[model samples]
Target: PVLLKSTETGQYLRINPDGEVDGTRDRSDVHIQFQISPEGNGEVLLKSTETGQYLRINPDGEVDGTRDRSDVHIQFQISPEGNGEVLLKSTETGQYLRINPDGEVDGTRDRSDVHIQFQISPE
Candidate 1:
């Protein structure tokens, strides 16, 4: 398990109940703890340590959280490009989770955003 800390934003990944994945500056926030679980092969489930919900890619290709955590959107593939950075590719859509400069989390088909480089911090 790990807490995804944005290297560019310095904020911990959080799941908003309103269905948006954003970064929060508070390290003590329970929503910051993400359970990076192995589903099989190279896939994983980014579950929340607090809510027990799994981070899933919404139909709009936006990052969000699910209550039951019973969907393929919760599956993701972690690609470590070394240098303390990693890319989270959604297995359902083959898109990358990128944090925009505005701190808005979204899935993109391109690797254009450097915000995609997340520092995997121990929870």
Candidate 2:
């Protein structure tokens, strides 16, 4: 499990029970589970334990979750930006995963915030 905290608010990101992604400080259920299964080569795959799916970018540009790891949408690049943050770029869309003004997560550009968890959760 990992907590993707917003650099702006220090709150955490999670997949809600409604199956939509949201950021909150509740420190409750569902909000407590998320994983970044690394794909190697500084890239990674996101998995929501709540749904057991990997996020796939669709043809229309909407991101949907699927069980297929073979999908190109499963590949995301983890690039280090400045000292304060790192970046996540999709290999399929060439776009970046970023945080919106509130909890909405959109894509593209290094200026947007990305998740970079360093703590090892043992609980």
Candidate 3:
């Protein structure tokens, strides 16, 4: 079974039957739950969820640009199985974001933020 607990701050804790417990320090202040199973064929895999917004920022010590902080915010949708390619959508323009895995933002040049890799969940 899976146990998901929320601490009222906007963070969540996840516990599984295998005695594994993981969570956020600050409560999510939102309802949270865990989805798990042990009926897999063999190996166990872990991955992150489909977060809407992602940011990559170069701290004040590195690179150029604003020099204050180079932050990139991107949001996207993933397939049901989380294996297929994710469909990235723009939060500011409500349009689709396309690119190659080589850090190449083919279609989206206006949007500074770029979507790259994704994490896969446990199998």
Candidate 4:
């Protein structure tokens, strides 16, 4: 019922229940979506029924790297000095890391596809 589309990649994911999203997969090209909530005391829901292909990481610099390690997922890393790293890992295709401005991941350059922009500097 919910449709999530990516502005940059022009790709989308259809969520029915829960899904294991693999960014390397053909249909898992985008990683941008919003969470919708029902009226009254109902709970909020996130739908991505395609596979394990969508993920988001908060400003926590800490890492155990266990959130989406089951299939394929991504997270962000922020150093104390305002530096950061973009790490995307997949049970199917191993893992990949992307540094900041010095290194260019390009557009969909790596299997993880694109890295959502984030504030690399500490807040």
Candidate 5:
């Protein structure tokens, strides 16, 4: 298990009780665990450690979770930037997983957003 922290918000990303994915300013509140790209090759499935759901980007450009691993929306491409930071690109929408500092998450077409950067930390 590990934690994904937004570079801008310094918050940990977690799956809400209702299956919505959101960020939390407090690490203690983060219960969601992640297995980063299990097979490597840059592509990873954000499977939830608790809910047994897959973290995925909605086709509508929203962020959420699902149980269907066969669904392409559950795949996110990881691009490491060194020092634990990485960029994520959702395969379903072909966009970056962008997060707002206020805790909202979304999909962005541009890879240039600084907030798109995230850190991987041990749980």
Candidate 6:
């Protein structure tokens, strides 16, 4: 298990008890376990270590968590930026996970947002 810290906010990606995906500055309050996409697979699946739920991209491009195993929207692709930073792209919508300047977890069509860089915590 690991923690994903947002490059823009310094907040860790967290799965709340209600299944909503949010960012928190307290790393001790959350845990995120992720896997690399297999060859030929466009994205990887991130499952919640606490609830056995998968982080899902909603139709509206919002990031959330769900226990449904058959949802294809839960897979995400990692675009490495070198120097321990990466972008999370949704396999279903081809959008990238972005933390808007206001600090919300949403998907974006544009790749220029600086808030998209997330680092996999070495801890």
Per-candidate TM-scores read 0.89, 0.69, 0.22, 0.25, 0.87, 0.86
How would you encode candidate 4's per-residue C-alpha lDDT over 1-123 as one tens digit per residue?
333333234333232224322222134333323233332332222323333233432233211122243322332221221233323322222433222232222222244444432221111
Per-residue accuracy of model 2 over 83-102 as CA lDDT, tens digit each: 54555567777776555557
The list of candidate 1 runs beyond 4 A from truth reads none
Whole-model lDDT per candidate? 0.80, 0.59, 0.27, 0.29, 0.79, 0.76
- Evaluated at residue 80, the lDDT of candidate 4 is 24
Q: Which numbered prediction scores highest in TM-score against the true structure? A: 1
TM-score of the candidate numbered 3?
A: 0.22
64-105: candidate 3 lDDT, tens digit per residue:
111112233222232222343233333333443333333222
TM-score of model 5 relative to the true fold?
0.87
Better of 2 and 3 by TM-score: 2
Over all chains combined, what TM-score does candidate 2 have?
Answer: 0.69
For candidate 6, the 10 contiguous residues with the lowest summed lDDT are 30-39
The alpha-carbon RMSD values of the candidates against the true structure, listed in the order shown, are 1.6, 3.8, 16.3, 12.1, 1.8, 2.2
What C-alpha lDDT does candidate 4 achieve relative to the native structure? 0.29
lDDT of 5 by residue, 9-120 (tens): 8877788757798888777773557766564666788776777777888777788888776887888888887677988788668888877888888888877778889987
Ranking by TM-score: 1, 5, 6, 2, 4, 3
The CA lDDT at 81 in model 4 is 18
Can you write out model 6's per-residue Cα lDDT over 1-123, one digit (the tens) per residue?
A: 667778888877777768877777866674445433353556577777777788888768888888887898887888898797998888778888876655578887788878888998757
Off by over 4 Å in 4: 14-18, 22-35, 39-43, 48-123
Model 5: how far is 115 from its true place, Å? 1.1
Order of candidate numbers by lDDT, starting with the best:
1, 5, 6, 2, 4, 3
